[PDB]
Amino acid sequence: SFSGYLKLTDNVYIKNADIVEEAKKVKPTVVVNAANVYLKHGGGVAGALNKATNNAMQVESDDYIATNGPLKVGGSCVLSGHNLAKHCLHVVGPNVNKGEDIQLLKSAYENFNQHEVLLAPLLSAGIFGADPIHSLRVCVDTVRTNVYLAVFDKNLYDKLVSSFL
C-alpha cells in the first residue's frame, strides 16, 4: 500500500513524491489527474501522467470529449487508470492563470468524496496558478475520504508541512 506519508488530518496524508512514480509503485484504485475541461494533457501533472501511459490516456480522453463534450471547471470524470491505477479521476480545478474563479476549487475537491481512497496532486497548484497553501487548506476542509497527496517540489512540500495549521 502507501508508504512514507506524513499524516496531516484524520483522512489527509502528504508526501514529497512524483505522482507518476508513486502511481507505478502503488497502482492505486484511483489516481487523480489535474485535468483541464478539454482533457488535453499537455503539461504539469496531466502531461506527466499521460506520458507515463504512452499517450493512451490522451487517446481515451479525446474519445470521451468527442462523445460528451468538455467538462465543467470544478467537475470530473472517471476514466481508465491504464498502467498507473485502476481508474483515473480527471478533476478540473480552476486555472487562475486563465482567470477562472478560485471559489471553484472547493467544488473540484468535492469530486474526491465519491472515492474511498485516492492518490492525488494539489488541485489548481503548479501551472494552474493558485496558492498551494490555499489548495491544501481547501483539500483538508472539503475532502472526507482518504486522500494521499503527492507534492513533486521538495521546497514546496517543506513549506506546506511547516505552514500547515
UniProtKB/Swiss-Prot annotation:
Catalytic activity: Thiol-dependent hydrolysis of ester, thioester, amide, peptide and isopeptide bonds formed by the C-terminal Gly of ubiquitin (a 76-residue protein attached to proteins as an intracellular targeting signal)
Activity regulation details: Inhibited in vitro by GRL-0617.
UniProt name for this protein: Papain-like protease nsp3
Annotated source species: Severe acute respiratory syndrome coronavirus 2 (2019-nCoV)
Subcellular location: Host endoplasmic reticulum membrane
Quaternary structure and partners: May form homohexamers. Interacts with N protein.
Function: Responsible for the cleavages located at the N-terminus of the replicase polyprotein. Participates together with nsp4 in the assembly of virally-induced cytoplasmic double-membrane vesicles necessary for viral replication. Antagonizes innate immune induction of type I interferon by blocking the phosphorylation, dimerization and subsequent nuclear translocation of host IRF3. Also prevents host NF-kappa-B signaling. In addition, PL-PRO possesses a deubiquitinating/deISGylating activity and processes both 'Lys-48'- and 'Lys-63'-linked polyubiquitin chains from cellular substrates.
Topology in membrane: Multi-pass membrane protein
Residue span relative to the full protein: 1027 to 1191 of 7096
Mutagenesis or variant effect for S162L: In strain: Gamma/P.1
Residue ranges annotated for the Macro domain, each copy included: 1-165
